[PDB]
Design an enzyme around this catalytic site. Structure first.
Site, mmCIF file in Angstrom:
data_model
loop_
_atom_site.group_PDB
_atom_site.id
_atom_site.type_symbol
_atom_site.label_atom_id
_atom_site.label_comp_id
_atom_site.label_asym_id
_atom_site.label_seq_id
_atom_site.Cartn_x
_atom_site.Cartn_y
_atom_site.Cartn_z
ATOM 1 N N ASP A 1 -18.998 -5.354 9.148
ATOM 2 C CA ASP A 1 -19.988 -6.331 9.568
ATOM 3 C C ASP A 1 -21.256 -5.554 9.908
ATOM 4 O O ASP A 1 -21.205 -4.554 10.633
ATOM 5 C CB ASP A 1 -19.511 -7.056 10.829
ATOM 6 C CG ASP A 1 -18.174 -7.744 10.634
ATOM 7 O OD1 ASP A 1 -17.352 -7.748 11.579
ATOM 8 O OD2 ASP A 1 -17.945 -8.292 9.534
ATOM 9 N N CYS B 1 -18.824 -12.967 2.390
ATOM 10 C CA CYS B 1 -18.517 -11.935 3.354
ATOM 11 C C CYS B 1 -18.183 -12.803 4.540
ATOM 12 O O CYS B 1 -17.383 -13.725 4.396
ATOM 13 C CB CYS B 1 -19.733 -11.020 3.595
ATOM 14 S SG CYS B 1 -21.370 -11.770 3.612
ATOM 15 N N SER B 2 -18.775 -12.569 5.702
ATOM 16 C CA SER B 2 -18.451 -13.458 6.806
ATOM 17 C C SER B 2 -19.387 -14.657 6.871
ATOM 18 O O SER B 2 -18.941 -15.817 6.894
ATOM 19 C CB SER B 2 -18.485 -12.721 8.145
ATOM 20 O OG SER B 2 -18.057 -13.606 9.158
ATOM 21 N N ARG C 1 -23.852 -8.776 3.630
ATOM 22 C CA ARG C 1 -23.169 -8.026 2.598
ATOM 23 C C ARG C 1 -23.295 -8.738 1.249
ATOM 24 O O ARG C 1 -23.594 -8.120 0.235
ATOM 25 C CB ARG C 1 -21.711 -7.833 3.017
ATOM 26 C CG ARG C 1 -21.586 -6.814 4.175
ATOM 27 C CD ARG C 1 -20.243 -6.872 4.892
ATOM 28 N NE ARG C 1 -20.114 -8.058 5.739
ATOM 29 C CZ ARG C 1 -19.083 -8.280 6.546
ATOM 30 N NH1 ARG C 1 -18.099 -7.398 6.602
ATOM 31 N NH2 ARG C 1 -19.048 -9.366 7.307
ATOM 32 N N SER C 2 -23.105 -10.048 1.251
ATOM 33 C CA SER C 2 -23.229 -10.811 0.029
ATOM 34 C C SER C 2 -24.638 -10.654 -0.544
ATOM 35 O O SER C 2 -24.811 -10.492 -1.756
ATOM 36 C CB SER C 2 -22.952 -12.290 0.297
ATOM 37 O OG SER C 2 -21.609 -12.475 0.671
ATOM 38 N N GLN D 1 -28.921 -8.360 6.015
ATOM 39 C CA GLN D 1 -29.077 -8.487 7.441
ATOM 40 C C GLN D 1 -29.509 -7.278 8.271
ATOM 41 O O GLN D 1 -29.643 -7.417 9.488
ATOM 42 C CB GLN D 1 -27.789 -9.073 8.009
ATOM 43 C CG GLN D 1 -27.737 -10.561 7.836
ATOM 44 C CD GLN D 1 -28.843 -11.222 8.640
ATOM 45 O OE1 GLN D 1 -28.725 -11.380 9.858
ATOM 46 N NE2 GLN D 1 -29.940 -11.570 7.974
HETATM 47 C C1 073 Z 1 -20.201 -11.450 18.254
HETATM 48 O O1 073 Z 1 -20.056 -11.812 16.865
HETATM 49 C C2 073 Z 1 -20.829 -11.212 15.965
HETATM 50 O O2 073 Z 1 -20.683 -10.069 15.647
HETATM 51 C C3 073 Z 1 -21.880 -12.061 15.378
HETATM 52 C C4 073 Z 1 -23.102 -11.505 14.911
HETATM 53 C C5 073 Z 1 -24.085 -12.340 14.357
HETATM 54 C C6 073 Z 1 -23.898 -13.757 14.241
HETATM 55 C C7 073 Z 1 -24.926 -14.813 13.622
HETATM 56 C C8 073 Z 1 -26.257 -14.056 13.364
HETATM 57 C C9 073 Z 1 -27.305 -14.876 12.629
HETATM 58 C C10 073 Z 1 -28.235 -14.332 11.818
HETATM 59 C C11 073 Z 1 -29.273 -15.095 11.089
HETATM 60 C C12 073 Z 1 -29.772 -16.324 11.635
HETATM 61 C C13 073 Z 1 -30.774 -17.062 10.938
HETATM 62 C C14 073 Z 1 -31.272 -16.573 9.705
HETATM 63 C C15 073 Z 1 -30.776 -15.361 9.174
HETATM 64 C C16 073 Z 1 -29.784 -14.625 9.860
HETATM 65 C C17 073 Z 1 -24.254 -15.014 12.177
HETATM 66 C C18 073 Z 1 -23.922 -13.901 11.186
HETATM 67 C C19 073 Z 1 -22.689 -13.189 11.219
HETATM 68 C C20 073 Z 1 -22.421 -12.138 10.311
HETATM 69 C C21 073 Z 1 -23.391 -11.769 9.339
HETATM 70 C C22 073 Z 1 -23.154 -10.626 8.387
HETATM 71 F F1 073 Z 1 -24.342 -10.051 8.231
HETATM 72 F F2 073 Z 1 -22.294 -9.748 8.940
HETATM 73 P P1 073 Z 1 -22.470 -11.030 6.718
HETATM 74 O O3 073 Z 1 -22.354 -9.718 5.907
HETATM 75 O O4 073 Z 1 -21.066 -11.637 6.897
HETATM 76 O O5 073 Z 1 -23.414 -11.971 6.103
HETATM 77 C C23 073 Z 1 -24.618 -12.494 9.305
HETATM 78 C C24 073 Z 1 -24.869 -13.534 10.210
HETATM 79 N N1 073 Z 1 -25.125 -15.865 14.201
HETATM 80 N N2 073 Z 1 -25.072 -17.074 13.560
HETATM 81 N N3 073 Z 1 -25.355 -17.907 14.564
HETATM 82 C C25 073 Z 1 -25.592 -17.394 15.798
HETATM 83 C C26 073 Z 1 -25.904 -17.960 17.006
HETATM 84 C C27 073 Z 1 -26.091 -17.137 18.133
HETATM 85 C C28 073 Z 1 -25.957 -15.723 18.014
HETATM 86 C C29 073 Z 1 -25.635 -15.154 16.759
HETATM 87 C C30 073 Z 1 -25.447 -15.969 15.622
HETATM 88 C C31 073 Z 1 -22.655 -14.291 14.723
HETATM 89 C C32 073 Z 1 -21.666 -13.461 15.280
HETATM 90 CL CL CL Z 2 -33.120 -12.507 8.247
#
Ligand code: 073
Ligand code: CL
Length: 289
Positions: free
Chosen positions: A185, A219-220, A225-226, A266
């Protein structure tokens, strides 16, 4: 010819000036934005893994269900590259049927998974595919059966062959599942070589061919990652078709891709990695291989 030592020079130049985070934040703010009304409807709250990651209304994949057609999945279509991808989130316990329904309806033949289902310090993903050949999965809500047929496990990725069956039409399709298991992640792949190797492998499978529906990548959240994977793939394609490889602006390509799904890539390091994998990969594809 010596145009390859050029782009890698400016790469080292960015690396020298430590401007990756700057370029990345610049991209986040130049990124387009579109509405996600459907995604935000109250009835689709449980269909979204994350509160802030949503598919744009214009590019979202619609399920052919009469009731709720929503699935946090987006169709990214790159014209010049001549490639389409469907980026989605890690299936939730209640959306595995939706996921496969989408795989079916969209006629995809390959699924690329870049996250892990579980561990301890990793985001959880539902076990949307059968881990045991003898334990097939049936998704009652979407009337689909899924069976694990093969499972070739390698160091940095597992290639599985699944059989998806529409219990209604009784048709069956071979679905290739490419699971890259060493991409944490918010992190980067084990190395550019393993990532590329994985990519080339997915390529050689025909899973990305225009013959089939778009490959499904997740991915998640379906963006970091995607986005890195798809950005690298599209950029490699472009550097191969274009006469002038260095004319490929990975930044423009990413912004182009972000018009289809928010947040692609990200972290600044993932952006760096995409540049690095693309340059190295381009060298490979144009260097006898
Ligand atoms: C504690 O858990 C985590 O690690 C975690 C980290 C980021 C997030 C994201 C963070 C939100 C980011 C975001 C929001 C708006 C636009 C673009 C990005 C979601 C997210 C998780 C994983 C990824 C990744 F990069 F690992 P992938 O490779 O699976 O895509 C991405 C996003 N997210 N989405 N909604 C949220 C509300 C409040 C706080 C954080 C929030 C969620 C959980
Ligand atoms: Cl972004």
């Amino acid at each position: 010819k010596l145009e390859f030592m050029e782009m890698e020079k400016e790469f080292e130049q960015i690396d020298k000036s430590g401007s990756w985070a700057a370029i990345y934040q610049d991209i986040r703010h130049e990124a387009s934005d579109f509405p996600c009304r459907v995604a935000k409807l109250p009835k689709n709250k449980n269909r979204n893994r994350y509160r802030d990651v949503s598919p744009f209304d214009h590019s979202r994949i619609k399920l052919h269900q009469e009731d709720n057609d929503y699935i946090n999945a987006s169709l990214i279509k790159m014209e010049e590259a001549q490639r389409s991808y469907i980026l989605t989130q890690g299936p939730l316990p209640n959306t595995c049927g939706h996921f496969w329904e989408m795989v079916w309806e969209q006629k995809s033949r390959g699924v690329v998974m870049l996250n892990r289902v579980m561990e301890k310090g990793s985001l959880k993903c539902a076990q949307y595919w059968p881990q045991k050949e003898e334990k097939e999965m049936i998704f009652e809500d979407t009337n689909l059966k899924l069976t694990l047929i093969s499972e070739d496990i390698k160091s940095y990725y597992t290639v599985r062959q699944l059989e998806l069956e529409n219990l209604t039409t009784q048709e069956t399709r071979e679905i290739l599942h490419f699971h890259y298991t060493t991409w944490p992640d918010f992190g980067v792949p084990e190395s550019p070589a393993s990532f590329l190797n994985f990519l080339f492998k997915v390529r050689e499978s025909g899973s990305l061919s225009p013959e089939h529906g778009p490959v499904v990548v997740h991915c998640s959240a379906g963006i970091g990652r995607s986005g890195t994977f798809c950005l690298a793939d599209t950029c490699l394609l472009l550097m191969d078709k274009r006469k002038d490889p260095s004319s490929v602006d990975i930044k423009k390509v990413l912004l182009e891709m972000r018009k289809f799904r928010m947040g692609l890539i990200q972290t600044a390091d993932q952006l760096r990695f995409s540049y690095l994998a693309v340059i190295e990969g381009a060298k490979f594809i144009m260097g006898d291989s």
